Amino acid sequence: VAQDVVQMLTKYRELQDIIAVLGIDELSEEDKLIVDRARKLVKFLSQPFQVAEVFTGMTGHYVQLDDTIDSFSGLLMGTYDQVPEMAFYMVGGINSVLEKAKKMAEEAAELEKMRRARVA
Amino acid sequence: VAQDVVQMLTKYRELQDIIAVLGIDELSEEDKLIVDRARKLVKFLSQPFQVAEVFTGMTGHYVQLDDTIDSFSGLLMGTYDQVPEMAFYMVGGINSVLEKAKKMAEEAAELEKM
Amino acid sequence: VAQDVVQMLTKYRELQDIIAVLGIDELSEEDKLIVDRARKLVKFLSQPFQVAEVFTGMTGHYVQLDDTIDSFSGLLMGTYDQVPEMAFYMVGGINSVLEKAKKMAEEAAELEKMRRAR
Amino acid sequence: HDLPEGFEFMEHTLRLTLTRQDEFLLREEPVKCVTVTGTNGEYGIYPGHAYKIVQLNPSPLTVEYTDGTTKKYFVSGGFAHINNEGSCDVNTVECTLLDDLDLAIAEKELAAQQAALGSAKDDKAKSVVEIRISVIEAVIAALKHH
Amino acid sequence: GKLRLYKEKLEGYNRFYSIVKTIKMVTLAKYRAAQGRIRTRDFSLRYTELAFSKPQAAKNALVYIPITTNRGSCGALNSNIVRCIDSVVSSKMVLMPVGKRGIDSFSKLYPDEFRYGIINDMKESMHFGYATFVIENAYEVSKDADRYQVIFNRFVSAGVQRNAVYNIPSYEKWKEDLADAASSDNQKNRYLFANALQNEEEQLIRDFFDFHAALAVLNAVGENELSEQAARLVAVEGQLTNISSL
Amino acid sequence: YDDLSKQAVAYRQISLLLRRPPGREAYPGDVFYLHSRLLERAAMLSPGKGGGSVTALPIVETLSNDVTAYIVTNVISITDGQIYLDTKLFTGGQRPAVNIGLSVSRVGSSAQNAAMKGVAGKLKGILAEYRKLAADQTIPMIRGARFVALFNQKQPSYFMNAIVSLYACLNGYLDDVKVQYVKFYEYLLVHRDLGIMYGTAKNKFFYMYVQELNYLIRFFTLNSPILHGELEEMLKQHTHLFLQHYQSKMNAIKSEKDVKALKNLLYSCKRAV
Amino acid sequence: YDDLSKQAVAYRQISLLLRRPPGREAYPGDVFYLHSRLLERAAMLSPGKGGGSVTALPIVETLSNDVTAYIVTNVISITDGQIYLDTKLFTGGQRPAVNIGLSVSRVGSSAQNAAMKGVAGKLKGILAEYRKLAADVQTIPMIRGARFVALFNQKQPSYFMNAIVSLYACLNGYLDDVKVQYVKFYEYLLVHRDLGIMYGTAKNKFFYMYVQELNYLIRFFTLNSPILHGELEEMLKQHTHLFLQHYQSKMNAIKSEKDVKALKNLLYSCKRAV
Amino acid sequence: SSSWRDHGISYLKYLNVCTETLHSTVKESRRAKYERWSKPCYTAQRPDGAGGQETIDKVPIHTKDY
């Protein structure tokens, strides 16, 4: 699992130079899916520290070794492709990712209902 | 003849930057033919050395001055446009080019039939 | 006044890229008037120098600070919209602008009368 | 959620709308009449309550405005879509102005294609040449006198 | 060493900017030519609406004619049409795309449904003949169908390229919907339209179908061409800012 | 020598502390001479003086793939070519991360075994065309990609087990076999054997379990009337049975706990050659 | 001075060997002063001291088009502009390979002859528009601009009369109908030969190209002048019409082996002789 | 000989022949503008083998092949 994260991130740095020159739309069909996962890998590597509650403004997360390996393994498989990107940013393990993704789905549902209220 | 090789290779380096940005199909009709010749000029400039039989795995080629000038002259004229590109790679004069092109035509005919 | 000249010239450079792509007619009603003023601002910023009488072939102009601020202020207001563009080119102060505009009106009246005949 | 169709962005005495390819030449312009030709002769379109679809042959139009002035065209094909309200949309493929065409070049082109008729490829290809002559004869006719 | 290579890297980007600026400026000329259209447009397909405008919403071959770009660097446009094909994808499906990117992309993603694709070199303007060539190829090897859908790119604004579609039902299905409209209080928008059309002879009704189908396609390709040059202008000017930042 | 970079730093310390004038990157004048007289003592002696040898493998650390450093450029100019290890290939997957384009042996052809010279002469032609065509599927493109998969290995391969798995790819026995299943194909060739497993064996001498054939191959080569026909049986039995019985599962297994089981199998196959 | 780069290296050797403190690129403090007092002795004296002159042409070798080197940057700041020779233009074909954009003369206008100032003032306007339009359909500037580039190629130096007339022809647009590849053949037939005298439509009273002594009359009066203007424009009108009719007609014809090669060998030799 | 309808050739091909004829009768001064709404410049094809497009050849394209 750890090697696949290093392999995917190595491909991503090569693809990042192509997007800067050509563009995001210019990439291939399979390479776009690698970017979606690799972008989530970079975001999921971030972690809110328990000593840095003053800085982040959020409680810390001690992520277990079994949690770390399983969550990253599933992301490489593509089990969390439908999960949004910002869910993975600054959280611990997979339970906190799916918790933030639930909060994002609920808040997005409320703001959409506000713009759907007015008609004609 | 020697100046035309240097001139064509100078145009080719400018065209090589355009193909990387735009594409091979984006070039003009005359410029495509310059690329086909210039690509062959770069390949034909290669030569298997007689001391380097161990490295190349092929026998050497002493190319005469009269052979060198005539073969390159004809390539600039466009007499060898129908000759394939890899025929010119790692050979001596024009006789070895047409010999390799004959071997390429025969082996391509066999693999196509199979 | 000085900031408005800098602001108007910044808008003008953005509008100059739009006219090259789309066209002069494609711009809005207010933006056309900004171009007419901004074009005059670029021309009015030019000045015939007193040491450079040999080069320009015209007498120099020392423009006073009070003249410089007032003339540019009125141009931003739109008090000199009816004044032509080439009146502002290579002059010093509003009196010389209106003097050249008078000479342009008189010479344009004569050349028009010549073609209203032949 | 689903795809909005291509018609959703289009909006909207007699008033016609004469078009070609995918661009109008006249847009809902008030007019006394217009005179097409096709299938059932030259049915002149006037103000009415009829509603009628009329297919067009290679033939001229003549747009007569209420004041008196006239603007003639020449058509390749298409239709003329008359409405209950005093308005129609003459959707042509090509609608050249009767002015952009040449009398000398058209008669030169008639002589050229008649030679091709004799030494045609076959009876299928020979019918296509007769379409070309059928336009040229109508082109020269609309120029002369009318 | 480092003094020479960083200069040659910088010289590389200078040539990059100059070549990409040539595309920018050339596509402005095409965009100026293409915008000679927005003032016109729309009024040409007034009675095309009464023929083919479906309200909403697979038994015998559904044809799809997505209108894509030739060369890339247009951006979110070819990708947008691929999402429409991936969203619909029924069992009864067959693809005949228009453009070199469509030919390349749909051949690999859908080898089963893809028959072949049409290419236009963009030398002359988008004309009726091109639209007839699309309609006639849409039933040639693909033959009869239930309907011929035409996915294309609408151009409402310079920034906003809308993704839109034209539905052309087959003549057998179309005449049945027309007969309903002619002799019922249902439909209403085309009560006297269907009566006026059906009063004319059978060849005229079939040629009316063919004509407005080609006219519906003619709008789609011409609208896509206008969307193509606009979106590429944004992508190329985005590329220039990327090159300038480097 | 692991490594000459740290030797030079130690020699620089000595030279600088004793007031020897420093030059490029603060090293003394004779830092080239330091490595030159070391590496030249490594040699291949004549028949007249025993015919013995000292082979040298000097290691030299580069900082961020910079060959233009003074100590690195010195040692390159002394040695008979190099084996360049790229950082991007390491993280990319290829291990050992040998950059073949950057790497070079100045006396390669004469150094090789007669058997190894036969297969390797063709591989230069295939990988040259594969690298060019990868930038800009032919038979070179198929067979070229399998070589790249075969080059991945943790522990060193035995000469017999290496050359046979390369000979298979050369003549095109791994063409129908996919790129991800090359290490599973190679593992089942070396340790196991499919001909002796199922039924269709009937080879008189040539098998992979018999490690002693190693030295017969080095003498006669694979392209030779003694071993050619017997070898091409072994590979024909191995391919047909692997494609039929073993590769059939991969079209099947498209479920949770079987896709993961396939991965963990294939990842362990990278280690053992 | 061929060249000041190797002088500086020699002065650096002397300074370093005598323990003079080195600075940028190991050169001494006064390596600027070395070239400065040399080049300043080259000057144009006053009428009060004879009006004599020493013109200086210092050569300075650059390494891979790097003007940022210490010795190169020093000499640029001393001299009155430069003549930059680009490596890509040399291999490209243009010889001498003078990069006009990079090159500059700080006292150009006042230095030129009255005749040469007339033609050259326009050439700056044409080549400015040609270079811009080449980066971003043929205009008059695009046609005439390309012919100037073909004319600038030369091995040995041109005589003032033979240069200015061939440039004046291109300025007023006598080589517009003439193709770009046949400009050197057009220029050769102007200087050495003459088509008007080549039995027929001559009838010029004084102005011809064989008479080299007109050189100094042109320098006095210029081409744009009532004395020579009408007589010159005859010479060029006769040369163009006859070249286009009789000599350029061959190019539509010659599409065969041993004639295409004969055309090449003719045109390649025309690059050398102006 | 006479009937374009009875020798195949749909209504749409007839219109293309009718327009292309109408464009060929345009005046010398302004024929370039009209010819670009007719002049054929397109083909139908698919990639096969390796970078070798077939070209289908079914819908005629040109006027004389109708």
**Cβ(E133)–Cβ(H42) below 8 Å:** yes
Distances (CA, A) of E40 to A26, C56, E48, G158, H23: 33, 50, 16, 61, 21
Q: How many CB atoms lie within 10 A of CB C54?
A: 6
Report how far residue D17's alpha carbon sits from residue D92's, in angstroms, rounded to the nearest whole number. Answer: 11
- For chain H, the residue count is 66
Contacts of G44 (CB under 8 A, 6+ apart): G51, G53
Express the helix, strand and coil content of chain A in percent, nearest 5 each. Answer: 65, 0, 35
**Which entry of F12, F19, F106, F192 is annotated as an active-site residue?**
F106
Chain E positions touching B16 (Cβ under 8 A) are: none
Residues of G with CB under 8 A from a CB of E: 64, 66, 68, 135-136
What single letter denotes the amino acid at residue G160?
F
* B and G make contact (3+ CB pairs below 8 Å): yes
- Name the residue among B38, B88, B83, B37 with its Cα closest to residue B63: B88
DSSP state of G67: T
Give residues 79 to 138 of G whose Cβ lies within 8 Å of B. 88, 91-93
Do the Cβ atoms of G92 and B10 come within 8 Å? yes
Tokens of G237: 């009108």
Angle at E177 between CA E174 and CA E180, to 5 degrees: 150
Question: How many separate domains does chain B show?
Answer: 1
* Biggest alpha carbon–alpha carbon distance for chain F: 78
Report how far residue G191's alpha carbon sits from residue G235's, in angstroms, rounded to the nearest whole number. Answer: 11
Report how far residue B5's alpha carbon sits from residue B75's, in angstroms, rounded to the nearest whole number. Answer: 10
Do the Cβ atoms of E21 and G136 come within 8 Å? yes
Q: Which domain holds residue E88?
A: 26-235
CB pairs under 8 A between C and E: 8
Do the Cβ atoms of E43 and D27 come within 8 Å? yes
Chain D positions touching E54 (Cβ under 8 A) are: 5
- Cis (ω within 30 of 0) for the bond into F58? no
Residue of chain F whose alpha carbon sits nearest to that of B86: F129
Considering only the beta carbons, identify the residue of E3, E4, E18 that sits closest to G135. Answer: E18
- Name the residue among H37, H33, H63, H14 with its Cα closest to residue E126: H37
Report how far residue D108's alpha carbon sits from residue G237's, in angstroms, rounded to the nearest whole number. Answer: 40
Report how far residue G171's alpha carbon sits from residue G229's, in angstroms, rounded to the nearest whole number. Answer: 14
Residue of chain A whose alpha carbon sits nearest to that of E246: A20
Tokens of F105: 């042996």
Report how far residue G268's alpha carbon sits from residue G184's, in angstroms, rounded to the nearest whole number. Answer: 9
Give C55-100 as a DSSP string: HHSS------HHHHHHHHHHHHHTTTSSS-HHHHTT--SHHHHHHH
Do the Cβ atoms of E32 and C20 come within 8 Å? no
Indicate the pairing of strand E147-155 with strand E62-64. Answer: parallel
Chain D positions touching H4 (Cβ under 8 A) are: 127-128, 130-131
Mutate to test the interface with E, among D2, D16, D21 (most CBs of E within 10 A): D21
Catalytic residue annotation of G: 106
Locate breaks in chain C with C to N over 2.5 A; list the residue preceding each: none
Tokens of A92: 């611990």
Chain H positions touching E123 (Cβ under 8 A) are: 41
DSSP state of G195: T
Angle at E190 between CA E186 and CA E193, to 5 degrees: 135
Do the Cβ atoms of D58 and H9 come within 8 Å? no
Q: How many CB atoms lie within 10 A of CB H16?
A: 28
Q: Which domain holds residue H27?
A: 1-66
CB pairs under 8 A between B and F: 8
Chain E positions touching G136 (Cβ under 8 A) are: 21-22, 25
Does F106 qualify as catalytic in the annotation? yes
Tokens of B62: 């002493």
Closest approach of E127 to chain D, Cα-based (Å): 7
Chain G positions touching B9 (Cβ under 8 A) are: 91
B66, exposed or middle or buried, with CB in 10 Å at 0-12, 13-18, 19+?
Answer: exposed
Closest approach of G136 to chain E, Cα-based (Å): 5
Q: Which domain holds residue C70?
A: 1-111
- Name the residue among E130, E202, D127 with its Cα closest to residue H8: D127
Helix (H, G, I), strand (E, B) or coil at D11: coil
Do the Cβ atoms of B22 and E19 come within 8 Å? yes
Helix (H, G, I), strand (E, B) or coil at H48: strand
Contacts of E10 (CB under 8 A, 6+ apart): none
Contact with chain H for residue D112, Cβ under 8 A: no
Q: Is the dihedral of CA G208, G213, G217, G219 positive or negative?
A: positive
CA-CA-CA-CA torsion for B40, B43, B44, B45, nearest 10 degrees? 130
Residue of chain F whose alpha carbon sits nearest to that of B55: F109
Do the Cβ atoms of E215 and D55 come within 8 Å? no
- Name the residue among D73, D90, D15 with its Cα closest to residue D48: D15
Report how far residue D99's alpha carbon sits from residue H44's, in angstroms, rounded to the nearest whole number. Answer: 37
Report how far residue F38's alpha carbon sits from residue G169's, in angstroms, rounded to the nearest whole number. Answer: 72
Q: How many CB atoms lie within 10 A of CB E134?
A: 26
Report how far residue G192's alpha carbon sits from residue G159's, in angstroms, rounded to the nearest whole number. Answer: 12
Question: How many separate domains does chain H show?
Answer: 1
Rg (CA), chain D: 18
- Name the residue among E19, E127, E119, E128 with its Cα closest to residue E70: E119
Report how far residue F97's alpha carbon sits from residue F153's, in angstroms, rounded to the nearest whole number. Answer: 10
| Residue B67, φ and ψ in degrees, nearest 5 | -70, -45
CATH at residue A28:
1.10.1140.10
**Cβ(H3)–Cβ(D39) below 8 Å:** no
Give B86-106 as a DSSP string: HHHTT--SHHHHHHHHHHHHH
- Name the residue among D79, D51, D130, D34 with its Cα closest to residue E204: D79
Q: How many helices (H) and strands (E) does chain H have?
A: 2, 3
- Name the residue among F14, F51, F56 with its Cα closest to residue F37: F56
Report how far residue H29's alpha carbon sits from residue D99's, in angstroms, rounded to the nearest whole number. Answer: 11
Contact with chain B for residue G260, Cβ under 8 A: yes
Give E151-188 as a DSSP string: EEEEESSSS-EEEEEEEEE-HHHHHHHHHHHHTSSSS-
Indicate the pairing of strand E62-64 with strand F104-105. Answer: unpaired
Report how far residue F190's alpha carbon sits from residue F184's, in angstroms, rounded to the nearest whole number. Answer: 10
Q: What was the resolution (in A) of this experimentally determined structure?
A: 3.2
Do the Cβ atoms of B77 and G92 come within 8 Å? no
Task: Sheet containing E62-64: give its strands across.
Answer: E94-95, E62-64, E147-155, E161-169
Which residues in chain G belong to E strands, given as ranges? 81-82, 104-105
The reply to whether C117 falls in a domain is no
Report how far residue G41's alpha carbon sits from residue G249's, in angstroms, rounded to the nearest whole number. Answer: 57
Give residues 43 to 102 of A whose Cβ lies within 8 Å of F. 77
Closest approach of B44 to chain E, Cα-based (Å): 27
Do the Cβ atoms of E239 and A23 come within 8 Å? yes
CA-CA-CA-CA torsion for A41, A44, A45, A46, nearest 10 degrees? 140
CB pairs under 8 A between E and G: 11
Give residues 122 to 161 of E whose Cβ lies within 8 Å of D. 126-128, 151-152, 154, 156
Tokens of F186: 């190679």
Report how far residue F116's alpha carbon sits from residue F166's, in angstroms, rounded to the nearest whole number. Answer: 10
Closest approach of H6 to chain D, Cα-based (Å): 9
Report how far residue D63's alpha carbon sits from residue D70's, in angstroms, rounded to the nearest whole number. Answer: 6
DSSP state of D10: S
Helix (H, G, I), strand (E, B) or coil at G131: helix
**Cβ(E128)–Cβ(D93) below 8 Å:** yes
Chain G positions touching B11 (Cβ under 8 A) are: 92
Chain H positions touching D130 (Cβ under 8 A) are: 1-2, 4
Report how far residue D120's alpha carbon sits from residue D114's, in angstroms, rounded to the nearest whole number. Answer: 10
**Cβ(A37)–Cβ(A81) below 8 Å:** yes
Contacts of F96 (CB under 8 A, 6+ apart): F85, F151, F153
Contact with chain E for residue D40, Cβ under 8 A: no
Do the Cβ atoms of E162 and D79 come within 8 Å? no
- Cis (ω within 30 of 0) for the bond into F3? yes
The residue behind tokens 């003592």 is: F41
Contacts of C14 (CB under 8 A, 6+ apart): none
Contacts of E102 (CB under 8 A, 6+ apart): E66, E67, E68, E78, E81, E117
Report how far residue D63's alpha carbon sits from residue D71's, in angstroms, rounded to the nearest whole number. Answer: 5
Indicate the pairing of strand E94-95 with strand E62-64. Answer: parallel
- Name the residue among B113, A44, H45, A48 with its Cα closest to residue E107: H45
Report how far residue A34's alpha carbon sits from residue A31's, in angstroms, rounded to the nearest whole number. Answer: 5
The residue behind tokens 């509603």 is: D51
Closest approach of B58 to chain F, Cα-based (Å): 11
Chain D positions touching H30 (Cβ under 8 A) are: 100
Contacts of G37 (CB under 8 A, 6+ apart): none
Residue of chain B whose alpha carbon sits nearest to that of F135: B20
What single letter denotes the amino acid at residue D40?
N
Q: Which domain holds residue G206?
A: 107-274
Contact with chain E for residue A22, Cβ under 8 A: yes
Residue of chain B whose alpha carbon sits nearest to that of G258: B77
The chains found to touch C (3+ Cβ pairs under 8 angstroms) are: E
Closest approach of E4 to chain G, Cα-based (Å): 7
Closest approach of C23 to chain E, Cα-based (Å): 8
- Name the residue among F34, F32, F75 with its Cα closest to residue F57: F75
G154 annotated among ligand-binding-site residues: yes
**Cβ(G115)–Cβ(B30) below 8 Å:** no
Mutate to test the interface with B, among E15, E70, E242 (most CBs of B within 10 A): E15
Residue of chain B whose alpha carbon sits nearest to that of F105: B55
Contact with chain G for residue E25, Cβ under 8 A: yes
Tokens of F249: 């599962």
**Cβ(E168)–Cβ(E147) below 8 Å:** yes
Report how far residue G106's alpha carbon sits from residue G124's, in angstroms, rounded to the nearest whole number. Answer: 15
Contact with chain H for residue D26, Cβ under 8 A: no
Express the helix, strand and coil content of chain C in percent, nearest 5 each. Answer: 65, 0, 35
Q: How many CB atoms lie within 10 A of CB E221?
A: 24
Distances (CA, A) of A70 to A2, A65, C51, F260: 11, 9, 82, 12
Helix (H, G, I), strand (E, B) or coil at E53: coil
Residue of chain E whose alpha carbon sits nearest to that of H63: E129
Tokens of E170: 């087959």
Q: Which residues of F69-90 are buried (b: 16+ CB within 10 A; e: fewer)?
A: bebbebbeebbeebebbbeebe
Indicate the pairing of strand D88-89 with strand D79-82. Answer: antiparallel
